[PDB]
Amino acid sequence: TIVGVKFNNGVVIAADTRSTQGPIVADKNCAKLHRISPKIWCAGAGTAADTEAVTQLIGSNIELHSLYTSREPRVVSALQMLKQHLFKYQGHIGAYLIVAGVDPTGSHLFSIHAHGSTDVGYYLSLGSGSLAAMAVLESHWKQDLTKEEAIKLASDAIQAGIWNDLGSGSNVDVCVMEIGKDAEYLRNYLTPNVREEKQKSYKFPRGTTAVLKESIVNICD
Amino acid sequence: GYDRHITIFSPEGRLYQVEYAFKATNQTNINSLAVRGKDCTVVISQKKVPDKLLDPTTVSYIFCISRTIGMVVNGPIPDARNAALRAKAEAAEFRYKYGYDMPCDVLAKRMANLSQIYTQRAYMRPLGVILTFVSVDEELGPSIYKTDPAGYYVGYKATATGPKQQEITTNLENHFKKSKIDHINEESWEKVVEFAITHMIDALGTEFSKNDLEVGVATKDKFFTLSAENIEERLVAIAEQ
Amino acid sequence: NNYDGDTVTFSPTGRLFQVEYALEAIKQGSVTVGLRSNTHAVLVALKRNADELSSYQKKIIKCDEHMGLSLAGLAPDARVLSNYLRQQCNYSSLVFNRKLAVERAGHLLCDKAQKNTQSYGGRPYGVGLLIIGYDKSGAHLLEFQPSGNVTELYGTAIGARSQGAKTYLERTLDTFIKIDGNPDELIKAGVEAISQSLRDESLTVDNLSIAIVGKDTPFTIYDGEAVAKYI
Amino acid sequence: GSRRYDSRTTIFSPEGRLYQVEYALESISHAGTAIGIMASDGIVLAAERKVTSTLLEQDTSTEKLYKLNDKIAVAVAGLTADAEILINTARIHAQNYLKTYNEDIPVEILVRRLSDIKQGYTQHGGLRPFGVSFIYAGYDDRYGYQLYTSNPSGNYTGWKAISVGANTSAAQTLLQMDYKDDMKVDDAIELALKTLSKTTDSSALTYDRLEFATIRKGANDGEVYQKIFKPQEIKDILVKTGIT
Amino acid sequence: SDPSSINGGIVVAMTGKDCVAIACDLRLGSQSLGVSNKFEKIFHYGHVFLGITGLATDVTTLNEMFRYKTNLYKLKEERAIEPETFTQLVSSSLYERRFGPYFVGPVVAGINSKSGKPFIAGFDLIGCIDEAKDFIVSGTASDQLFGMCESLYEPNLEPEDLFETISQALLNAADRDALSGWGAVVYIIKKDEVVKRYLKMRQD
Amino acid sequence: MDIILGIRVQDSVILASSKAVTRGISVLKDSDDKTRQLSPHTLMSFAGEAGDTVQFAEYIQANIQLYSIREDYELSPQAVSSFVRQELAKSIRSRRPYQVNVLIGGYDKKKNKPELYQIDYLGTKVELPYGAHGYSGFYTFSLLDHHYRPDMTTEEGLDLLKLCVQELEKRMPMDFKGVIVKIVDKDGIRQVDDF
Amino acid sequence: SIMAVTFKDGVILGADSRTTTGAYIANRVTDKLTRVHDKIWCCRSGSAADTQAIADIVQYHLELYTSQYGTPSTETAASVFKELCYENKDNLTAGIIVAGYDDKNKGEVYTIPLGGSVHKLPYAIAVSGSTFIYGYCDKNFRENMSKEETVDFIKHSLSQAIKWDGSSGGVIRMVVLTAAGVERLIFYPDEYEQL
Amino acid sequence: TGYDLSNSVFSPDGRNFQVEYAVKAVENGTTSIGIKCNDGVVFAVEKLITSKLLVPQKNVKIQVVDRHIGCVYSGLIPDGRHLVNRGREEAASFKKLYKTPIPIPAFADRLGQYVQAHTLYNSVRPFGVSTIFGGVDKNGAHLYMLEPSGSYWGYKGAATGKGRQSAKAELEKLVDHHPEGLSAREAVKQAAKIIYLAHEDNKEKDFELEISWCSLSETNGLHKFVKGDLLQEAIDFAQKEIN
Amino acid sequence: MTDRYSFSLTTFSPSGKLGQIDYALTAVKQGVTSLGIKATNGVVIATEKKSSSPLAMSETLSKVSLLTPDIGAVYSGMGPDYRVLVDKSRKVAHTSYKRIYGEYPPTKLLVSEVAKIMQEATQSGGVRPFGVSLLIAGHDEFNGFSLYQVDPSGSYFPWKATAIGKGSVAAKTFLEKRWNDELELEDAIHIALLTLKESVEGEFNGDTIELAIIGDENPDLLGYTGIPTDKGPRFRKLTSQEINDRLEAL
Ligand SMILES: [Cl-]
Ligand SMILES: [Cl-]
Ligand SMILES: [Cl-]
Ligand SMILES: [Mg+2]
Ligand SMILES: [Mg+2]
Secondary structure, eight states: OEEEEEETTEEEEEEEOOEEETTEEEESSOOOEEEEETTEEEEEEEOHHHHHHHHHHHHHHHHHHHHHHTSOOOHHHHHHHHHHHHHHTTTOSOEEEEEEEEETTEEEEEEEOTTSOEEEOSEEEESTTHHHHHHHHHHHOOSSOOHHHHHHHHHHHHHHHHHHOTTOOSOEEEEEEETTSOEEEEEEEEOOOOOOOOSSOOOOOTTOSOEEEEEEEOOOO | OGGGTSSSOOTTSOOHHHHHHHHHTTTTOOOEEEEEOSSOEEEEEEOOOOOSSBOGGGOOSEEEOSSSOEEEEESOHHHHHHHHHHHHHHHHHHHHHHSSOOOHHHHHHHHHHHHHHHHHBSSSOOOSOEEEEEEEETTTEEEEEEEOTTSOEEEESEEEESTTHHHHHHHHHHHHHHHOSSSOOOSSHHHHHHHHHHHHHHHHOOOOOTTTEEEEEEETTEEEEOOHHHHHHHHHHHHTO | OOSOSSTTOOOTTSOOHHHHHHHHHHHHSOOEEEEEOSSEEEEEEEOOBSSTTSOBOOOEEEEETTEEEEEEEOHHHHHHHHHHHHHHHHHHHHHHSOOOOHHHHHHHHHHHHHHTTTBSSOOOOOEEEEEEEEETTEEEEEEEOTTSOEEEESEEEESTTHHHHHHHHHHHHHHHTTOOSOHHHHHHHHHHHHGGGOSSOOOOTTTEEEEEEETTEEEEEEOGGGGGGGO | OGGGGOOOSSOBOTTSOBHHHHHHHHHHTTSOOEEEEEETTEEEEEEEOSSOOTTBOOTTOOSSEEESSSSEEEEEEEOHHHHHHHHHHHHHHHHHHHHHHSSOOOHHHHHHHHHHHHHHHHHSSSOOOOOEEEEEEEEETTTEEEEEEEOTTOOEEEESEEEESTTHHHHHHHHHHHOOTTOOHHHHHHHHHHHHHHHOSSSSOOGGGEEEEEEEOOSSSSOOEEEEOOHHHHHHHHHHTTOO | OOGGGSSOOEEEEEEETTEEEEEEEOOEEETTEEEESOOOOEEEETTEEEEEEEOHHHHHHHHHHHHHHHHHHHHHHSSOOOHHHHHHHHHHHHHTTTTSOOOEEEEEEEEOTTTOOEEEEEEOTTOOEEEOSSEEEEETTHHHHHHHHHHHOOSSOOHHHHHHHHHHHHHHHHTTOTTSOSOEEEEEEETTEEEEEEEOOOOO | OOOEEEEEOSSOEEEEEEOOEEETTEEEESOOOOEEEEETTEEEEEEESTTHHHHHHHHHHHHHHHHHHHHTSOOOHHHHHHHHHHHHHHHTTSSSOOOEEEEEEEEETTTTEEEEEEEOTTOOEEEOSEEEOTTHHHHHHHHHHHHOOTTOOHHHHHHHHHHHHHHHHHHOSSOOOOEEEEEEETTEEEEESOO | OEEEEEOSSEEEEEEOOOEEETTEEEESSOOOEEEEETTEEEEEEEOHHHHHHHHHHHHHHHHHHHHHHOSOOHHHHHHHHHHHHHHTTTTOOEEEEEEEEETTTEEEEEEEOTTOOOEEESEEEEETTTEEOSOSSTTTOOTTOOHHHHHHHHHHHHHHHHHHOSSSOSOEEEEEEETTEEEEEEEOHHHHSOO | OOTTSSTTOOOTTSOOHHHHHHHHHHHHSOOEEEEEETTEEEEEEEEEOOOTTBOTTOSOOOEEETTTEEEEEEEOHHHHHHHHHHHHHHHHHHHHHHOSOOOHHHHHHHHHHHHHHTTSOSSBOOOSEEEEEEEEETTEEEEEEEOTTSOEEEBSEEEESTTHHHHHHHHHHHHHHOSSOOOHHHHHHHHHHHHHHHGGGSOSSOEEEEEEEEETTTTTTSEEEOOHHHHHHHHHHHHHHHO | OOOOOOSBSOOBOTTSOBHHHHHHHHHHHHSOOEEEEEETTEEEEEEEOOOSOTTEETTTSOSSEEEETTEEEEEEEOHHHHHHHHHHHHHHHIIIIIHHHSSOOOHHHHHHHHHHHHHHTTTSBTBOOOOEEEEEEEEETTTEEEEEEEOTTSOEEEBSEEEESTTHHHHHHHHHHHOOTTOOHHHHHHHHHHHHHHHOOSOOSTTTEEEEEEOSOOGGGTSEESOTTOOOOSEEEOOHHHHHHHHHTO
16 A cells, blocks of 8 residues: 655655465565655565665666756656656566655656556555545545645555555655755654554473484684 | 868878868857856847748747757858757757656757867768757756857857857856856746846847847746747837836 | 779879779770661670680670670670669569660669668679660660769760760761661671771671670570571 | 777787787786785785875775785786776685585686686687786695786686786896795795885885785684785885895 | 475474574375475575475475575675575575466565664565564475464574474474475574574374 | 486486387397596486487587696586586577486585586576486385485485386387486496396 | 537647556546647546556647747648657557647647547547547537637536546646637536536 | 878868869869749759760759759769768658658758768768759748858858859849749749850850759759750740850 | 677787787876875775866866765766766676676775676677776775775775875875875875875865765764664765865865
C-alpha cells in the first residue's frame, strides 16, 4: 500500500513495510520509500528488485544530470526518465511508482505504471491496498490541506491498507517534502503491529544438539 | 610541420589549428553585441548585403535554437548553420529526455564540449565560429553564454564579438563602472534595444539604417528577431533624443 | 606534382590529377569506334595481341539483349562496370518487367564512377566505354569516361589515334545517320571509320571485332570468319 | 588523406629491428632501477623511486612494486600509467584461470599471456607499444620460486638474478660477481640493497627513495607470504645491513 | 521442471550478542535420488560468509564468480570487503541477469571489522535485498525455517546459546522437507574467531 | 548411451560403461566404448543425447591434449573436472545446450590419490567414492552404500562392480549388452579384457 | 469517448476523464486532450502508456520541425502520428484524433485508428475501445457551426456515450482552437447528466 | 607551409585552400543562371557543342528534385549529379515523414549541411560545383545558389561558371529596371538573352541553349522544361538582342 | 568518410621521449597556478580565477569541481580538457563503482580511473593527450584524507602538499618550509592563501580566488533528514565572503 498527498507548501508520500512471496511474509519491515534525489522521493509497488533497481538507475542519472546542469533536479526529469525506461521494457520491469518532490518549479505528485503510463493528481495510491487507501482518500481529501492534515490523511490511507489488505501490513513509512525546507523522512512513523510477549522462552539447555565434528575456520591471511 | 595541420600539441604546448579557427571567426567582417535588461536579453549584429542580386531577408547570422534560446554566430555561414542545426537537435532531444526546456548555459556547455572534442580528435576540424547564446532562463533570469573553437565557454553581464570587438567591449566596461550594476536598469525591451544600438554606434563610430542592423530579443518564454520596420521605429526613437 | 597523391586532393587550378591519369590509361588503350542510324547502332573494335603466339584481347561485352559496350583501357575495370550494368539491366527486368533505358544506363555508370573520385583509399576507374543499345526511343550510342562524364552521340571513337576515326564520322555524319534498315552498310561505314586510326597494321580476320543492335536485331558480337565479309 | 600523418609504429628497419620497440627500450633505460634476486627459500624485489621530493607522501605510495595475486608480484620500470593497464589485465587473467581450473595460475602462463599482449602491439593495430619492462617474482607448485622479465618486444626470459631500467649493465656485473646458487633470502636482501647503493645516481641510498618486497615461505608449513615493506621496515633493514 | 527445487537444500542465518551464525544442510539430489551428502552451501570471502540454496550448478558458478570479484576487490582496495558492501555486490550481480536469472537464494552473514556490528541479509534470484535484525532463511524448507526461527529466536543470544537455537531451527525444518537433510554444518562467527560444527542428524 | 558407473578404491578409479547403442526399435551396435582418454592418468565416460555425447567428449579431449602440449604438463583431475564443469555450465544457457552427463576418473600423481568426479549436463559437479548417471544409480547406490569400503583393493572394487552389473542385468528393462571396464591408477589407463 | 469537431472560427476537441483497469477507475480526472504544438492537439484512446509514448515523440518531432522549417500544418502532425502508429502497429494499441488550427487552413480534423491509416473529416467521434462511428447523427452536424452550437453538440454526444459506456465517465474536458488562442472548458456530471 | 595539401586544414589566415581550389573547378565550367520572377523561378544553362556528333536536345544538364524544385550547376558535372541524387533522398525522407513537399529553404539547408560536411574531414574532397536551385512552395517563389564551402543565400538573380561576371552585370540591370517585379514569360526571354551575352566569354565552340521554369500561373507550381515554340521564341529574342 | 585515424598520434622518438606527453606538460606549465595542502583533519585545494574579460561573470566558470560528495578536483592547463574530464570522472564514479558497490569510490580508485582515461588518450588512435594536470583531494572511511596529482601521461602520485602550473617551482619551495604533520585544517587554508598570493599578480580577494576543502561532514548541505548514517558531503566550496574573512587576519 503506497500513497501520495499534495498539501499547501509541498507533497507527502507514505507506504507500508510488508514484503510477501505467495502467502508468506518475506520481510516484516522493508523500506518502500526511495530517494531519487535529496528532495525527490519515490514509493514503489510490484517486483521489489525492479522498484529498487529502476529507482537507483534514474537516481544515479539524475545526480549526474544535476552536476552537469549545476541545478537542483526536477520531478518531471525523474518522471520522463522512469516512464521512457519502463515503456522500453513493455511492462516486463514490474515497477509501479508514486513519484513526488519539491523542485524550483514547485511541488509535484505523479504515479507511474509498469507499462510507462503516468498520471497527475492531488492524491494517488498504488499496489494491492490502493482500493482500501483510495476509499480513505476519496472520503477525507479536501483542497488546501495543511501539512499536519496531509500526514494524517496519508498515514490513515496506509493504515486502511495494513488492516484490510493481506498484501500490506507492519509499520507506516512517511516522507514530507515541503517547499524551501529539507525533505524529512519519517521511517517507522507508526508501529501499530508490535509482536506481544511470547508465553515461553525456547532457549535450549547447552549440549542439546548432537555434534559429529568441530573445527576452527581460518578467515585470516 | 604536420603539428600545424591537425589538432596535436606543438613543442610550446599550442594547437595551431584551434588558433587559425579563431581567425576564420572574423572572415565575415561582422560585429555582434549582447546586453541584459531586467526582464530581457538583447543581441544586435551588423547586416552587410554587398551583392544587389541577394534576397536580403535570407541573409542572417541570428538563429532561433529553441523557443526560449537565441544564437548569434560570428564566422562563415556554413559552419554557423552546422552549429545551428546541431544546437536545435540538442535542445529538442533535451526537452524529450528530461521533460523541461534546455537552459541557455547547459546548451552552451554541450556545444562547448562538442567543440572540445574537435580540438582532441584529429579526423574532425574545429568549426571557425563563435556562438553567443541568449535567453531569459526561468532559474537564472536574463542569460548570455558564449562558445569558441577552443571549447571555452563562460557567462557574461554583456559581450561583443568580431573585428572591432575590443572597442565595443571597453565601451560597455566603462558604462558598467558608472552604472555600478550587472545589467541595463530598464523596464521595456524596446529601450534595451535602443541602448544596445546607441552604444554600438558610439563604439564603432558609424551610423545605421534599418537594413544595416539585425536584432534578436529574448523575453520570458520566447526569443524573436525584429523586422526592418521594427528596427526603423527603434532608430527613430534614438534620433529624437 | 604535390596534388596527385590521391583522388581526394584538388590542385591549385582546380584539377583532379588521379582522374586525369586514369583518363591517360584510355589513350594508351587500342582504338574502338561507335556509330548509329535511326534503326541500328554499331560497335567496331581493333583488338590487341601480346605477340603472334597470343590471342587478341576481347574489347566488346554484352550487357543485355538490347544493350552492350566496347572498352579501351584497364580490361578488369570494364569487367567491373559491365557486370554492374548487367545487374542494373537485370534489376529493371525482374522488378519492373522493363528494359533499362540506355540514358539511365549512362546515369548509373556516371554516379558509380563519381563516388570513386571523392573518397580517400579508393581509385578512379581506368577505362572508357562506348555503350550502344535499342530501347523504347530507338537507337542510342553513349561515351563513358571515368571522370563520370557520360555523353549521348550519333558517333565517336576512343583509344590511341581515335582522332582519325572521330574526324571521319564528323564528315560522314549526314550519310551514315540515314542508313536505316541496312545493317551491313552501317557496319561498312564503321569499318571505314576505324580504318582512319590504323598505322602500318591493317584489319585481319582475327584482329577485327564488330557488334550490332537494332529494331529486330538482338545485341550480337561478330568475331573470326564472321567479320571476313567486311575486310 | 590520413596516410600523411601515420608514423607506422609496426614496421621493420632495413637492419630488421622494430623502431618503436628499440625507442621504448631507450625510454625504459632512464627509469628507476628494479632488481630481482631468486634464493633457494624465497625471492627479493628491490626498486629505486625516481628522484623523490621531501613533500611526497611515502607511506601511502605505490610506483614500482605491484601485487598480481597472492603468489605473484611485479617490479615496474617505465611509464607507470602503461604498467597499470597491463597489471589490471594480468590480475584478471589470473582470476579467469582460478575460476576455470580451481588452481592458482602457474607463473610462466601469466607471464606468457602478458608478453603475448605486448607482442601484438608490435605486429598489428598501428598503436605505440607499452613503454614498460616487468620483473615477475612468483611461486607455484611445479617450478617453485621463479624470476622472469618481459620488455616492450613481448620477449620474456627466466633469471636467478636480474635488473631492469637504469644502469642494468653495471647492476648485472655486480649481481653476476656476488650471486651463488645456495644463497638464502636474508643474503639476497643484502645483495639487492648493496647493488642499488652502488648503481644509484643519487648521493646516498635512503629509505624514502626505495620500494622493497619479499616472497618467502616464512608463514607456518608449506604456504607463501608476500611482504610489501613499510617505510619504517625499509629504514630498519637499511640500518641492519649497515648502509646508513 | 522447477530449477529452485531440483537439487534441494536450505540455509539459515541468525544474529546474537557481538556474533552471527550461518548454517546449511549437506544434501545434493536429482529430485527423488540423493546423490551427495557432502555438498556444503556456505562459502567465505575473507570474513564475509555467503550461503547459497537453489540450482546446484548456479551455487557452484556464483561461488566461483564472487571469489573472482572479491579477489580483484582486495587487490585494488588493499583491504577485505565488508558484509554491507558485499551485499550490494551480490544484488548488482544478480540483477545484471534480470531476464536470464541464476536460480539461487543467497544469504550473507558476517561482522563489520570496523564497527563490530553483526550483519545478515537475504536475496531473491534477481537480487532484491532483505536486510533483517533477527534472522534470514532460504531454500526448499523456507516455510519450515520461518516457523522454527519466528518461535525459537530471541535477541542478544550468546555464541554458545545461539549455536543451539540455529541448530534446532535447521534440524527440525530439514526433517519436514524431503529434499533437505543428509547432514548439516553450523558456522559460529565472533569478531576474531570462527568455529565450524557438523551436526548429527537422521540420514533419510 | 544409458549406463555409466564409477568406483574410487584405495589406489585406483574403475569406470564401467554399457556397450549397447539403440536407435528406435533396433540395437545398432553391442561393442560401443562410451569413454575418451583426456590425459594419460584421466579418463571420462559419458551418456546422454545422441551426437552431443561424442561431440562434447572429443572437444574436451582436444582442449586437454592442447594444454598438455603447450605446458608440457598433465593437468590434475580436479583441474580437468573444473574445466569440464565450466564448459557444461556455459552450455545450459546456450541456444542449444549439450545434453551430456560425464564421470571423470583420474589418478593425481602429486597427491598419489585416486579421484572420481560426477558432472551432470547442468554443470553440477560433485566428488564421490562411487557415482552413476541416469537410472543406474537407482539400483547401485543402495548396493555400494552397503558393501563399499575406502581401503578396498582393485580386485575387491571389480567384484563389487560385478555385483552392481548383475543387479542391473536382473532388474533393468533394457538389454545394455554388458559393460566395458577401465582402471585408472598410478601406471595410467588399462581396459579389463574379459567381464 | 473522444471527438473533434470543426466549426466557423476553428475546431473543438472533446474527451471524457475516465481511466480503467478492468472495472476499477484508475484515474477519474484524466486529461485525454494532449498538446503536440501551440494549436495542434490530439484526443487519446486505447493504451494510456502507448498514446503517451507516441504523443511525447510527436511533440519532439514538431518542436524540431518548428526550429528548422517554422509552424507545421495539422496534416504534417497527422502524418507523424500515422508513421509511428503504422510502422509499430504490431506492438501498439493507440486510437488518436488530431485537431489543429492554421490561419490559412482554419480548423482541420484527422483520425488515426488502430490500423495506422489516416482520414481527414469535418468531425470524428471514437467511443468504447477506440471504435470510430460513421455519421453519428450527421443531421445534428452542419458546416460553419458557431462555438456555442459546437460545444452543445460535443457535450450532448459525449454525455450519451458516458450514459451507455462504463469505460467513459467523470468530467467532460474540451479544448477550443481558434485564431484568438487556446481555451480549456470543463463540464461536471451535474450539468451534462440532465440532457 | 603545405596547408593546401589536405582538406579541412585551416591556413594561418583561417582559410580552407582545398575549398578555394574547388571554386577554380567551378569557374572553369560552363555558364548557368537563375532568375526569380513574380510567382516562380527560371533556370538556364550554356551547353558547349564540342562536336557535330553530339545529339541536339539529348544531353540534358538541368535536373528536377521531387516535382517542384529545379537544379542547375557549373563545374564537375558528375559532382552535381551526386548532389542532386542526395537532394532527392532528402526531399523523399522529408515528404515521407511530414507529408508536405519539402519547402525550398528547408531543401537549401539539406544540400548546405551535406556540402559543408565535405569540408570537415581530409578523407573527403569538397564538391567541384556551384549549384543554382529553387522552386515554388506554400510561402511563394525561392531562388538559391550553393558553393563548395556549403555557403548559400537567397537571390533575386544568380550566375556561376566562366561567364558569371558578364551574367551578374546583366542580372543587376534587370533588378534595377524592374523593381515592382518581372513576369515568368519575360524571365524566360531574359534568361535566353543573358546566356547568349555570357557566351561571348566562351565563343570558340558554338553552344546549345537549355531553359526550365517553375511558375504558380504558367506551370501550376511544378518544374517543366521550355521546349518547342516557347524555346524558339526565346532564342529568336536573344538572337535579335546580340545584333 | 569515417575516422581513418586508427593509428597512434603519440609515438616514441629515438631519444625515448613521448613528444605529445612532453608538449602536454608544457601546456600545463603555461597554465594558471593551482595547489593542494593536506591537514590532519582535512585537505584544501585552491587556484586563481584568471578572468578572460571583466564583462565575463567568473562565478559561472568553476575551476574547482565536486566529483563525489567526499572528492574534489582542481587543475592547471587547458580548461575545456578539464571540463570534459570532470564529466567523464563523475560518470565513471557511478558506472564502474557506485552502481556495483552502492557506495562512492575511495579517492585512490577514482584517481586510478581518471588516470586510465588520460593514459588511453596517450595510446589510442587519432587522439592527442589531455593538456591538464589534476589535483584531486578526497576522504574515504578506510584511507582517511588524501591528495593526488594526475599528469597527461596518466601517472598519479600522492602528496602531503604540492602545486602545479605557472609558479609551481616557487610554490612547492614555500610549502616545504611551512608544512608539518600536525597542521589543523584552518592552518592549511592560511598557508594555501599565503602560497597563492606569491603566484597571483593582480587583485587578490574572494572574487579572484577559488578555494574548496575536504573536511568534516556538512548535515546542512545534505538536503534531507531521517537517515542517521547519511551525515552529508565532506566537500565544501568556500564562499567569496568566507575567503575575505581569512584575508583580514593574514
Ligand atoms: Cl533560425
Ligand atoms: Cl556533453
Ligand atoms: Cl492518460
Ligand atoms: Mg582536428
Ligand atoms: Mg530429511
